[PDB]
Each structure stands twice: as structure tokens, then as C-alpha cells.
Design a protein around this ligand. Structure first.
Ligand SMILES: Nc1ncnc2c1ncn2[C@@H]1O[C@H](COP(=O)(O)OP(=O)(O)O)[C@@H](O)[C@H]1O
Ligand SMILES: Nc1ncnc2c1ncn2[C@@H]1O[C@H](COP(=O)(O)OP(=O)(O)O)[C@@H](O)[C@H]1O
Lengths: 755, 131
């Protein structure tokens, strides 16, 4: 039967769209905009409008949430689709709002909600369905109770709409909305895919795999900083697959007077095991099963042992699945990782860059943003925030917007009419004000992300690009030839050269091109884990790097310890041995199959430990020279993209004139150019202001006080105070080391001996 | 690296269980690599691991002298800087015989080139004598 299709998550959020692949339209002779009739479970029915979309597969149908609840089906089931061309324009429509959606509106719902939603839409509806309308601050659902003709009709301008009456009370099998689905999660695509991979099958079809016989998972650990939304993920999964989500809180089991805590745990487990595909969620696991030495009393030991024995006693059952949420995966008791207990660990990292954009677009759904709002700019500016912080920021912005216009009713016991409340355009000013007075929470957290620097930010280093390409991209692209030819791929690369230049940009660019996460460790951190402890930090950072493969670990300023202990200070050498031994050991213990590179940059190469430069460790050495002439003009071109231009002075002339400079110096010069431009513009504005205060209305209209374009004179002023950052002696020393390492490589070719 | 790590504290335990594990799983050939690293890290601008150095060497020596000939446990130590090793090691009963490994020459070079020449893709290739 080539008519049925399996439902799937959609992208278009309109209430009357479906996404079919073009071969399906070719097979079923389906046009665009036709009316199709959809049959599903429970003998429910609805109509929709076909839209073209190539992303979905041929056997797969994409559809939104309102129609999915209309059909009383969940994702992964089957529906029947057909053309339905006999529908004609309706005559009259009777709609009635739901009781638990309009609490406190008391206004003309027809002019507020129905009129824009039904405008020039031609949305076909069927009697008995429910559709959701976005509005001022809330969402209102209407259940169409009567239409002419029945059951099918199409919206036309000359149709009768009745929106008066006692709101209908909620149904039972309606699958109440406002419950979190898959659209309420953003910035967690990969981890959500991983969770859905191993939980969908044992929950949707429970008997089939058991008949086959496999070991289904019996525990999933979700660990991450608080506020990232782990409970949201668990609740969304439970409400989507179909289960009996039974949360048990952390402190609630500790507040009970001793004896009945174990009784509560036992009752919870025995209740959850009977309701069939159940999903228990132990929130705040570390509160009841902490590290062993933390516990002092005896009730904690009894509670922990009770939990462990219940977990071991869970044998198959009705496919009950337990998930526990913790803060960091080293605080729980180590005994809760044996096989059979919690064994699969899935992390939920802090959203970065784009993820903040999706979170903000999810939260700023109901509110009517003004056209000047740039959500992308706010997302780019704000970092160190988690989901809860963004929600609080949006709420504070809404309240700031609503307070300055408190002349609305302030007296009427009946709540505000939707009319004025729909005339609130939250602007950029409110968002900036709310952002100003808000303290973040993440802050000091290691950031794992994809850097956005392209291979155009740098201009020179043409052959170093080739070397890095060979070292990095090929092993993950064509492993077959490497494994056949016999070589083990290189695991480390060490950079060395004059300070500044472009090491960090090279690392970020290669991480971007290879499309893998980037983790940076600075010298200050190395010394921080050099004056006190030395072991914990290295273990945790390497574990984090390994778990997020692929990634490009970076060790900036590896020579800092050698510089520090090379002076009068001679006591921290033991910790230096500690740090170097940790780095050596957890490079030696890394399996070559895992794709985790290591890159280190040193200003002074000679004084570093020669034990590192051994096979199986950082081996390849790449020399990074000082850019000269032709590279420098590209450096300037890359730097001065900014926003203004320099159409007057020639870049090539200053490239020729400034030979022997590092990139940092050129960026400094370009920055002082902007500083001079800002000074001149601001002093011009001040002069213009005072010349109005001398004579009121001196100029009715203003002019272009110095145009945002960096002139030549600013360039000369900024260039007059120029610096030669590096002296020649370091250049000779680096060249001497280069020729010394090259002198071991000396030989006078061949003649094809013994052909 | 592990030997250098076990200076700072844990200078008794780790040696104890490694020797115990070597003894219980007899026969075995215990291997100590980079034995000169002790005094190599000892010498420098720090001079603070010297107590750690002597304690590690002394647990090694005490456990070595406690061996019994009944168990076939063989100890081999390797180093590349012999002039710096503590002389107390070189006594009868402890590590005594000294064997010098010279650089490969002629037939040794051919043999190692052949040994490294297994691979899957060697094709038919050419002579290795001249290399
Ligand atoms: N896509 C999202 N990602 C992360 N957090 C979100 C997202 N959408 C909403 N949130 C916020 O997460 C909060 C719930 O998370 P919470 O249960 O506190 O996690 P935890 O309890 O682990 O800190 C909600 O109040 C919501 O504002
Ligand atoms: N295309 C480029 N070539 C060389 N240097 C550049 C280029 N673009 C920017 N720079 C400058 O080079 C500097 C790199 O120095 P930095 O990353 O701080 O330390 P490191 O010495 O480890 O690279 C940056 O501050 C940046 O301003």
C-alpha cells in the first residue's frame, strides 16, 4: 500500500501545512495547495494543505504539533493520505474558546485573535478539531463546534463567524497542550539525538526486542551545570514517547523522619513498575548518594544501600527506565557505575552562539517584538548564560516594558482587554536594560565550541596551511590507506616562533575547517594548577577532551613553567614534575583510535623539556616565521575589514614601509587609527553642541560631522607612534635553533643507486 | 614518568603493590625504564626532590634485597646515562652485571631494515643493502 506514511517532526510551524517529498507528489499526482484528507487512529480526521519540501524522505511525512494532536497519534506511527478535491467554500463557522486558556482576558476575541489568523489564509477546517492562536502574552485554543457544509469547509471572506458563549470545558482524551514537546528544546540537538536513539525503541515497541533478546539500557546519567534544562529533556521524552513519568525529588526523600525514607523509595519503585513503560527520574542525585567520605551519619548509608539494592533488583520488569540528574560526574558514590546500574553517561553542555539564538526565539514566542529588535546581536553579545538566565532575562524585559505604560486600567477587576495589551512593542532598549542588571551564573566554565575564524582571517603562511592539512584532515577522511600502509598517524604538533604572530589563529582556523570542538588552556591556568594541586585538573580536562571527540586540544604557553622556575624561584620544581608527568602520562594513555589532537605553542623552544619531543608524543615541529612584505598587505587587508574604509591611503605602501613587524603591531596601529577617528568625531560633536549653547537654534538641521571613514591624517597620526615589538636578537636565536635542528638533516642527493 | 610521579608522597605504597604483583604472578621479568631520570630531575635549579629521590631509591633497594630465590622474578633496569646512577645499586645481590648495547652496524642495519619492512604494501621493492 503506497498511500500510508509515517509521521515525523516538521519545521514549518503553521497549523495547516504538511511537507511531502516531490517523488510522493509525482506518484500520487499531488499538486501544491490542494486539500488532502488525513485519517489516523481512534477514527479521528482532519484536513490540511500540501507544501513542497525536499528535506523529508519519500516514505516520511513532516507535520506540526497541532495536527498531530488533532489526529491523536504520536510521532513514529502511520497515517493515510489522499487527495480530497470535493471541498468547497464554507458558509458559517461556530467557534468556542477552551476554559483553561482564557482565564482573565474578557475582551473581543473576534477582533483580537480570529481576525488576523483567518485573514487571507483559506485554511480548511473540520468539525471537532482544535487549533491554537498566538496572541498578546498567552496562547488561546478554539474548538470548532459547527461548520457549513459539514464536515469540510474553506475560509472565505463572506463567512459567518460566531465567537460568543460559555467556554467549553476541557476534554479527557484531548492530549492537553502546553505540555513540553520537542519544539521547546533548543541548542541540544546532538545530545537529544543520542538520548532518543536508545530510548525510543524500548519504549515505543516493548515486546519485539525482548522476543529477539538484547540487553536494553537500565540507566542514563544526565550531568551538567544547573539550569541547563535536564528535567525539561526528561519530561519531553516521557511526554512524547508515551509513558508514566514519575518524578521523585532529592530533598523530599531526605526531609522525611528517617524510617520512612526507604518506605517512600520502595513504594515509588513498586508503583512505577506496574504502570507499563515507566520512566523514573531521580532529580538531584548527589543530594542522597554523595561521595563516600562526605557522608558522616548512618541514615545516608542506609538510603544509599536501599537505592543500590532496588536498582539491582530491577530485573527486566515492564521496561522501566531510570534517569538521574547530577551536577558533576565525580560527586556521586563510585559504586553507582558498575555494570547493571547507571552506566551510560550523557552530558548537557552550556549552549554557545547559535544555541542562545534558538533559546531566545523559543522564549520570545508570544510577545510582539518590534521590528528594530536584533535577537542575533543579543545572542552574540551574551555569553556565560544558560537557559534559565535567558528565560529570566526575557521575563524582566517584558516587565520593564509593561511598567512604563501603567495607565491601562489599574482599577478594573476584570482583567485587561486584549486590545491595548496587543499594542506592546518590546524594543531594543528594554532588552539592553534587562541585560545590564542581570548577573550570569556559568562564567568560569571550560567552553567547548566550534570557533568561527575562517581561513581568510589569516593571510600568510601558505605552506604551514598545507602541513596542518596533511597532519589533520587526512586521517579522518581516508583511514583505509593509513591502516593498510602501516603507519600510525601523528598525535601531536608543536609550534614555535616569535611571540605574537598567528599561532592561536592557526589553531582556531584548523579547528573550524576540520569542523571539530576546540578547548583552550592558558599558561595562567597551568601555573594555577602548579602552585597547589596538580593531578585533578589534568585528569578532568583530558576526560572532557576525550568525551567530546573530535576536538583540538590546545596548550598555550607551554614554556611558562620553565620560565617561572628558571629564575630565583626554586621550590615549585616538584609540582613542575607533577604537571609534566600528568601531561606525559595522559598522552601515553590515549588510544590512537580516538581522534583527539594535541597542539602546543612555545615562545622559547630550547629550554623546554626534551622528553616531550619523542615519538608517541609531540613530534612534528613547524617553524612560524615573521610575515614580510607580501604577507603584511594581506594582514592589513584582513584586519581593516572592520566597518569603515580607507579609500585614500594605499595598503601596499605601508606594507613595504613597515618590514620586520608582527601582526600584533599592525593590529595595534589599526586600532589607534580608530581611536584617533573617535577622538576627532567626539570633539567635533562637542564643539557643535557648545556652538548651539552659544546661540539657540544656531543650525536647525545638522550635517555630516566627520564621516565614518578613516582618513589619511588619522593614519599618519596613529603611525607616528609605532613600535618594533621584537628585537633582532630573538630572530637570530630562532634562526640559529632552526639551522641547528636542520644541520642533523644534511646530505648530498643520490644517483638512483642499484636500479 | 610514573617513577618520577611517585616521589611526591606515595613513595611506599606504589612500590609495595608493584613488587607484590610482580611476585605473585611469577614467573615475570620486571622492567624499570629510564632509571637515571631520578638523579636527572634531582639535578637542577630546584634541589627539592632529593629526599623524594632517595626515598624512592631506598624503597626499591629494600624491596629488592627482600627477594627470595625461590620465586623466578627477574629484574632488568635500563638507562642511557650510567655515570650518574647511585653506586649503591651496583653491588652483589642487586643489579650487578653490566651489558653495553652498541650502535647497529652493517648486518644489524640490514636486519632492522628488513624487520621494519613487513607492512601489507611492500610491493616487490628494491635492495636494502646500500641503504
Ligand atoms: N531549550 C532549552 N534549553 C535549556 N533550558 C531551557 C530551554 N527551554 C527552557 N529552558 C529553561 O529550563 C528551565 C527548566 O530547567 P530545570 O528543570 O531547572 O533544569 P535543572 O533542574 O537541571 O537545572 C525552564 O524554566 C526553562 O525556562
Ligand atoms: N592574519 C594575521 N596574521 C598574523 N597575526 C594576526 C593576524 N590577524 C590577527 N593577528 C594578531 O596576532 C595575534 C596573535 O597573538 P596571540 O594569539 O595573542 O598569542 P600567540 O603569540 O600565542 O599567537 C593576535 O593578537 C592578533 O591581533
Amino acid at each position: 500500500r503506497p498511500n500510508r506514511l509515517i509521521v515525523d517532526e516538521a519545521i514549518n510551524e503553521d497549523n495547516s501545512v504538511v511537507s511531502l517529498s516531490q517523488p510522493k507528489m509525482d506518484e500520487l499526482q499531488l499538486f501544491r495547495g490542494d486539500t488532502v484528507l488525513l485519517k489516523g487512529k481512534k477514527r479521528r480526521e482532519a484536513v490540511c494543505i500540501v507544501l513542497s519540501d525536499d528535506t523529508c524522505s519519500d516514505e516520511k511525512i513532516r507535520m506540526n504539533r497541532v495536527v498531530r494532536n488533532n489526529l491523536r497519534v504520536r510521532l513514529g506511527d502511520v497515517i493515510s493520505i489522499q487527495p480530497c478535491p470535493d471541498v468547497k467554500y464554507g458558509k458559517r463557522i461556530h467557534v468556542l474558546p477552551i476554559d483553561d486558556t482564557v482565564e482573565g482576558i474578557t475582551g473581543n476575541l473576534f477582533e483580537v485573535y480570529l481576525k488576523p489568523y483567518f485573514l487571507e489564509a483559506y485554511r480548511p477546517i473540520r468539525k471537532g478539531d482544535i487549533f491554537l492562536v498566538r496572541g498578546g502574552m498567552r496562547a488561546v485554543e478554539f474548538k470548532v463546534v459547527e461548520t457549513d457544509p459539514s464536515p469540510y469547509c474553506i475560509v472565505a471572506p463572506d463567512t459567518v463567524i460566531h465567537c460568543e458563549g460559555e467556554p467549553i470545558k476541557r476534554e479527557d482524551e484531548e492530549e492537553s497542550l502546553n505540555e513540553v514537546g520537542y519544539d521547546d528544546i533548543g541548542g541540544c540537538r546532538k545530545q537529544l539525538a543520542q538520548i532518543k536513539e536508545m530510548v525510543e525503541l524500548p519504549l515505543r515497541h516493548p515486546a519485539l526486542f525482548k522476543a529477539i533478546g538484547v540487553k536494553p539500557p537500565r540507566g542514563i546519567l544526565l550531568y551538567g551545570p544547573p539550569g541547563t534544562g535536564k528535567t525539561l529533556i526528561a519530561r519531553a521524552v516521557a511526554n512524547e514517547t508515551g509513558a508514566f513519568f514519575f518524578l521523585i525529588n532529592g530533598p523530599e526523600i531526605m526531609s522525611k523522619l528517617a524510617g520512612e525514607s526507604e518506605s517512600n523509595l520502595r513504594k515509588a519503585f513498586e508503583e512505577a513498575e506496574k504502570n507499563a513503560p515507566a520512566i523514573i527520574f531521580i532529580d538531584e542525585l548527589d543530594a542522597i548518594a554523595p561521595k563516600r567520605e562526605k557522608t558522616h551519619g548512618e541514615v545516608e548509608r542506609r538510603i544509599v544501600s536501599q537505592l543500590l539494592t532496588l536498582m539491582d533488583g530491577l530485573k527486566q520488569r515492564a521496561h522501566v527506565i531510570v534517569m538521574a540528574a547530577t551536577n558533576r560526574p565525580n560527586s556521586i558514590d563510585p559504586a553507582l557505575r558498575r555494570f547493571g546500574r547507571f552506566d551510560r553517561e550523557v552530558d548537557i553542555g552550556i549552549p554557545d552562539a547559535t544555541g542562545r539564538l534558538e533559546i531566545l526565539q523559543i522564549h520570545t514566542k508570544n510577545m510582539k517584538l518590534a521590528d528594530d529588535v536584533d535577537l542575533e546581536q543579543v545572542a552574540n553579545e551574551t555569553h556565560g548564560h544558560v537557559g534559565a538566565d535567558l528565560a529570566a532575562l526575557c521575563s524582566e524585559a517584558a516587565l520593564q516594558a509593561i511598567r512604563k505604560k501603567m495607565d491601562l486600567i489599574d482599577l478594573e477587576d476584570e482583567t485587561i482587554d486584549a486590545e491595548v495589551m496587543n499594542s506592546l512593542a518590546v524594543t531594543m532598549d528594554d532588552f539592553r536594560w534587562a541585560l545590564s542588571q542581570s548577573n550570569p551564573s556559568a562564567l568560569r566554565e571550560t567552553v567547548v565550541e566550534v570557533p568561527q575564524v575562517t581561513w581568510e582571517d589569516i593571510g600568510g603562511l601558505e605552506d604551514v596551511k598545507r602541513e596542518l592539512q596533511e597532519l589533520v584532515q587526512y586521517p579522518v577522511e581516508h583511514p583505509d590507506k593509513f591502516l593498510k600502509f602501516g603507519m600510525t598517524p601523528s598525535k601531536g604538533v608543536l609550534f614555535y616562533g616569535p611571540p605574537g604572530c598567528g599561532k592561536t589563529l592557526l589553531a582556531k582556523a584548523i579547528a573550524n575547517e576540520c569542523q571539530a570542538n576546540f578547548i583552550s588552556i592558558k599558561g595562567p591556568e597551568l601555573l594555577t594548577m602548579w602552585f597547589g594541586e596538580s593531578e585533578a585538573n589534568v585528569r578532568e580536562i583530558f576526560d572532557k577532551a576525550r568525551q567530546a571527540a573530535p576536538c583540538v586540544l590546545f596548550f598555550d604557553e607551554l614554556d611558562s613553567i620553565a620560565k617561572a622556575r628558571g629564575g630565583n624561584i626554586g621550590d615549585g620544581g616538584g609540582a613542575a614534575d607533577r604537571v609534566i608527568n600528568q601531561i606525559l602520562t595522559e598522552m601515553d594513555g590515549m588510544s590512537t583510535k580516538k581522534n583527539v589532537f594535541i597542539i602546543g605553542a612555545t615562545n622559547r623552544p630550547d629550554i623546554i623539556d626534551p622528553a616531550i619531543l619523542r615519538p608517541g608524543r609531540l613530534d612534528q615541529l613547524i617553524y612560524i616565521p615573521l610575515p614580510d612584505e607580501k604577507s603584511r598587505v594581506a594582514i592589513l587587508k584582513a584586519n581593516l575589514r572592520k566597518s569603515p574604509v580607507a579609500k585614500d591611503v594605499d595598503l601596499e605602501f605601508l606594507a613595504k614601509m613597515t618590514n620586520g613587524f608582527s601582526g600584533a603591531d599592525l593590529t595595534e596601529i589599526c586600532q589607534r587609527a580608530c581611536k584617533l577617528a573617535i577622538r576627532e568625531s567626539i570633539e567635533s560633536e562637542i564643539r557643535r553642541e557648545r556652538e548651539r549653547q552659544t546661540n539657540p537654534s544656531a543650525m536647525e538641521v545638522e550635517e555630516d560631522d566627520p564621516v565614518p571613514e578613516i582618513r589619511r591624517d588619522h593614519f599618519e597620526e596613529a603611525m607616528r607612534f609605532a613600535r618594533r615589538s621584537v628585537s633582532d636578537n630573538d630572530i637570530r636565536k630562532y634562526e640559529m635553533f632552526a639551522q641547528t635542528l636542520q644541520q642533523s638533516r644534511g646530505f648530498g642527493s643520490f644517483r638512483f643507486p642499484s636500479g
